[PDB]
């Protein structure tokens, strides 16, 4: 889950602009199947990667860029 291969595959799947945002707020480059979007606009993904650790199989993509609440 820390090897550069896991970051390479996620970098390629997302593309630049999606991954650049994760390189700005998330600090990690992840890719997952989209599950839904909520009333505020956040999008919630699920990670299918067999190497991802126990508590990191779901995450969010906040609407803003420089800030997250």
């Amino acid at each position: 889950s820390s090897s550069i291969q896991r970051t390479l595959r996620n970098l390629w799947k997302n593309g630049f602009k999606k991954s650049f945002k994760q390189l700005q707020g998330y600090n990690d480059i992840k890719s997952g199947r989209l599950v839904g979007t909520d009333s505020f606009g956040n999008k919630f993904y699920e990670v299918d990667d067999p190497v991802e650790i126990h508590m990191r199989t779901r995450f969010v993509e906040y609407t803003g860029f420089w800030r997250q609440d």
């Binding site: 820390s2 090897s3 550069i4 970051t7």
Partner: protein
């Protein structure tokens, strides 16, 4: 499972030594060579065709 995020600072520290060494090796060598080309500034700068 090698962590690449952990080794990022080392690749930057490796560049720190290389930056200082690369400059010193080339700049001092170039200056020593140039002043060892002739007794005036119009000789040191230019390189003759022959």
């Amino acid at each position: 499972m090698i962590p690449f995020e952990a080794l990022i600072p080392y690749a930057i520290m490796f560049a720190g030594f290389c930056l200082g060494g690369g400059v010193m090796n080339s700049a001092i060598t170039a200056d020593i060579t140039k002043r060892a080309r002739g007794p005036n500034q119009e000789i040191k700068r230019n390189v003759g065709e022959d």
